[PDB]
Amino acid sequence: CPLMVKVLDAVRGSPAINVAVHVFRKAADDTWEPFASGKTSESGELHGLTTEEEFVEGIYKVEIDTKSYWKALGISPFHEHAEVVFTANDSGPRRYTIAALLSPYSYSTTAVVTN
Amino acid sequence: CPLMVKVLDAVRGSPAINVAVHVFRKAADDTWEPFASGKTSESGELHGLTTEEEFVEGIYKVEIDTKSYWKALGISPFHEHAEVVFTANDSGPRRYTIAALLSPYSYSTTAVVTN
Amino acid sequence: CPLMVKVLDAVRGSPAINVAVHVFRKAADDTWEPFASGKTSESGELHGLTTEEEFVEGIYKVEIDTKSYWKALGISPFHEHAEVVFTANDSGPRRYTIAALLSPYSYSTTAVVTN
Amino acid sequence: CPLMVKVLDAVRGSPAINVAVHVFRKAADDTWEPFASGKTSESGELHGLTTEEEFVEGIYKVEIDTKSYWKALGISPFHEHAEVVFTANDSGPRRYTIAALLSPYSYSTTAVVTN
Ligand SMILES: O=S(=O)(O)c1cccc2cccc(Nc3ccccc3)c12
Ligand SMILES: O=S(=O)(O)c1cccc2cccc(Nc3ccccc3)c12
Ligand SMILES: O=S(=O)(O)c1cccc2cccc(Nc3ccccc3)c12
Ligand SMILES: O=S(=O)(O)c1cccc2cccc(Nc3ccccc3)c12
């Protein structure tokens, strides 16, 4: 599993559960092509988006539907979604964990790249 | 000034100077149309992107070109850029300050909205 | 003004107003001695804590009373307070801006140091 | 395991390994009494600090020696250490994960409280 997404709720101090995540890969004509999607689990995690074979070098975009999450909690948010755009590899494939720390008017995003 | 962007370097503890910023607005046909652009000053701030008249209701994307910034400092960062996507002025005109806190493998973004 | 504190509310996207701040300095006997205190203004900022003359070299602790802030807004937060502990002026006098970004179960803190 | 600490390096996008962590419990006379300590593992995690039996309600302080971490990497940091001060329980015991996201001049800290 080369790509994992994790989402935290900073208001409740909990995993952000059932958050939709859409992954896109940048095509040769500079457009965003749908690549993978899912929703975070009870632990706020999303695994099995892709495989090592399919996760080739290139620019990827991870969109996290933060607005719908806050809407379900009855809390007015600022952002439409959180966006994480990055180049897969320098490098030689390894494991990418993208984490998103959510607040209604702020978010932090981190990348842990491990062997 | 209804839209301001501020960028901080969390490695040096200093304003992030000369950071390129591109702003887009979502058109009726669902495409991102160029809206405004500029670079942060010596104080890490970018003003004068737009006017109250031109800053109508809509969905805006603020793209902060973080990769270029880090590379010039000799750092190969994770993200291509920081993205901040939000609905603006849907309850009348407001003033928006978008701040970004930059690390090579992480960023935080905040919004302060005033009436 | 060599020491400034700024506090942001990440739930409301606004300055955190009337937040109590206590500053301490480490004495030669290793105890924390009261150095200065105040509360953030309507802009979320606290100035005039000290002077260049009184702000000598040493280890300082800035205690930001975040729990009291959240409770008044009807929120039971995780942290008692945010702490920021740092050596100051060990390479000559500097100006320090300490910022805190507050969420109920998370905070970020930054420092901008200028000569 | 009622108390877990996790430390991330935001410059390298990696677990922060071999970071010293000291835990204190607030005594009746308002002093900090040493309670538990350790160093983060290769995964940047510290488990087995305490037991459910010993981890009674009260105020705790988790000190993360961030300065020594950056020093070993040859990077000049701002903070002496990161401090996380919190009340264990409202509530009825459960699991506390304290995470710290480290940059040389900034840190974020989060709490995930789970059943
Ligand atoms: O690791 S934990 O805090 O246990 C954690 C537990 C459960 C869900 C999480 C979701 C996103 C990030 C986390 N960690 C995190 C926190 C701060 C910065 C980066 C990642 C989550
Ligand atoms: O405010 S200051 O630290 O003075 C600051 C000074 C200079 C440049 C800054 C750029 C972006 C954000 C800041 N503040 C900030 C810090 C944390 C959260 C949100 C905004 C900047
Ligand atoms: O700069 S602004 O967002 O205008 C801002 C406006 C009003 C109050 C603020 C309080 C603390 C930090 C800020 N900025 C900040 C944001 C991110 C990182 C560091 C500092 C505040
Ligand atoms: O969960 S991961 O990113 O995989 C992660 C992996 C390895 C070490 C980590 C250390 C601290 C926080 C993490 N997460 C985190 C990130 C952002 C906010 C809160 C916690 C760590």
Side-chain angles (χ1 to χ4, degrees), chain A:
Chain A
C1 196
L3 181 67
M4 300 165 175
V5 178
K6 288 167 78 170
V7 188
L8 200 158
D9 178 334
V11 166
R12 295 201 267 95
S14 71
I17 305 161
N18 202 42
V19 183
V21 178
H22 294 252
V23 186
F24 304 86
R25 186 190 157 84
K26 201 176 196 178
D29 66 358
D30 282 333
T31 60
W32 294 108
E33 174 196 348
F35 174 81
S37 64
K39 286 183 159 75
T40 55
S41 71
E42 215 80 35
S43 66
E45 292 184 9
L46 182 55
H47 310 81
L49 282 164
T50 187
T51 65
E52 182 85 321
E53 196 150 285
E54 292 150 72
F55 194 53
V56 299
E57 292 183 307
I59 300 166
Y60 293 81
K61 177 194 265 187
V62 176
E63 285 187 354
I64 303 159
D65 183 16
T66 60
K67 193 175 184 184
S68 298
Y69 179 73
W70 294 118
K71 284 165 84 175
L73 273 39
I75 295 164
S76 188
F78 179 77
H79 305 92
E80 287 296 301
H81 42 75
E83 292 307 293
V84 182
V85 182
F86 68 100
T87 298
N89 254 13
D90 184 37
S91 170
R94 36 189 134 272
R95 312 297 167 90
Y96 295 86
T97 300
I98 303 294
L101 174 72
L102 310 187
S103 297
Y105 269 70
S106 178
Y107 66 87
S108 297
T109 193
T110 60
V112 172
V113 186
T114 289
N115 292 305

Side-chain angles (χ1 to χ4, degrees), chain D residues 26-101:
Chain D
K26 201 176 196 178
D29 66 358
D30 282 333
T31 60
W32 294 108
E33 174 196 348
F35 174 81
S37 64
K39 286 183 159 75
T40 55
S41 71
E42 215 80 35
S43 66
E45 292 184 9
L46 182 55
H47 310 81
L49 282 164
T50 187
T51 65
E52 182 85 321
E53 196 150 285
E54 292 150 72
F55 194 53
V56 299
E57 292 183 307
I59 300 166
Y60 293 81
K61 177 194 265 187
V62 176
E63 285 187 354
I64 303 159
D65 183 16
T66 60
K67 193 175 184 184
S68 298
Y69 179 73
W70 294 118
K71 284 165 84 175
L73 273 39
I75 295 164
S76 188
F78 179 77
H79 305 92
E80 287 296 301
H81 42 75
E83 292 307 293
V84 182
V85 182
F86 68 100
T87 298
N89 254 13
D90 184 37
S91 170
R94 36 189 134 272
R95 312 297 167 90
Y96 295 86
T97 300
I98 303 294
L101 174 72

Side-chain angles (χ1 to χ4, degrees), chain C residues 16-78:
Chain C
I17 306 161
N18 284 321
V19 181
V21 177
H22 297 246
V23 187
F24 305 88
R25 187 180 173 271
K26 197 142 101 164
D29 62 12
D30 260 27
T31 59
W32 290 109
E33 192 163 292
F35 177 76
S37 75
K39 275 173 178 177
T40 60
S41 64
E42 308 306 301
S43 63
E45 297 175 1
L46 173 58
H47 301 84
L49 285 167
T50 191
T51 58
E52 183 172 322
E53 272 192 16
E54 291 308 303
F55 191 39
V56 295
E57 192 284 328
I59 299 169
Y60 292 81
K61 170 168 71 174
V62 173
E63 165 193 294
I64 302 164
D65 298 327
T66 56
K67 186 176 185 186
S68 296
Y69 175 80
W70 288 116
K71 286 287 192 168
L73 274 20
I75 294 150
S76 302
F78 182 76

Side-chain angles (χ1 to χ4, degrees), chain D residues 90-112:
Chain D
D90 184 37
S91 170
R94 36 189 134 272
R95 312 297 167 90
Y96 295 86
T97 300
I98 303 294
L101 174 72
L102 310 187
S103 297
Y105 269 70
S106 178
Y107 66 87
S108 297
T109 193
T110 60
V112 172

Side-chain angles (χ1 to χ4, degrees), chain B residues 6 8 97-101 110-112, chain C residues 6-8 14-16 43-45 99-101 110:
Chain B
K6 296 170 75 169
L8 180 38
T97 300
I98 303 305
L101 174 69
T110 62
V112 177
Chain C
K6 296 170 75 169
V7 190
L8 180 38
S14 68
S43 63
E45 297 175 1
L101 174 69
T110 62

